[PDB]
Amino acid sequence: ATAGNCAATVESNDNMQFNTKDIQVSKACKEFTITLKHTGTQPKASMGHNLVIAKAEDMDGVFKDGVGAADTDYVKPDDARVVAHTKLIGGGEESSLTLDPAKLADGDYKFACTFPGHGALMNGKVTLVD
Numbered sequence: 001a002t003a004g005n006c007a008a009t010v011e012s013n014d015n016m017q018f019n020t021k022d023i024q025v026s027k028a029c030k031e032f033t034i035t036l037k038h039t040g041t042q043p044k045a046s047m048g049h050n051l052v053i054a055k056a057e058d059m060d061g062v063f064k065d066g067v068g069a070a071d072t073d074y075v076k077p078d079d080a081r082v083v084a085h086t087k088l089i090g091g092g093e094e095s096s097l098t099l100d101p102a103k104l105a106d107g108d109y110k111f112a113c114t115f116p117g118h119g120a121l122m123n124g125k126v127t128l129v130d
């Protein structure tokens, strides 16, 4: 499936997991939407999740700058090394982002939760595909 997916939905729970560790972005899409749904009962301050997509080579700086942006859902208003980012969502809440697929051609991109203590496990691969 490539010509029938301009959006994706990721489910995160308070058991510390994503329902997918691989996201394939179609270059057939002008923009790609990713919707995150936190299917749990824990509030964002106790077990919050976000989905940040950035260049893997720069992913370290993304997490680092994310921790410094605690007031802004652990996402820093910048979007230079970061391609897209959701907000922190609690049990029942959802957040979404829109990214330019053609910007993922720079190399290997990853998606992860920039919540301190989560990124070590809550991360995967996001690849631009045809």
Ligand SMILES: [Cu+]
Pocket: 047, 048, 049, 050, 113, 114, 115, 118, 122
């Ligand atoms: Cu998280």
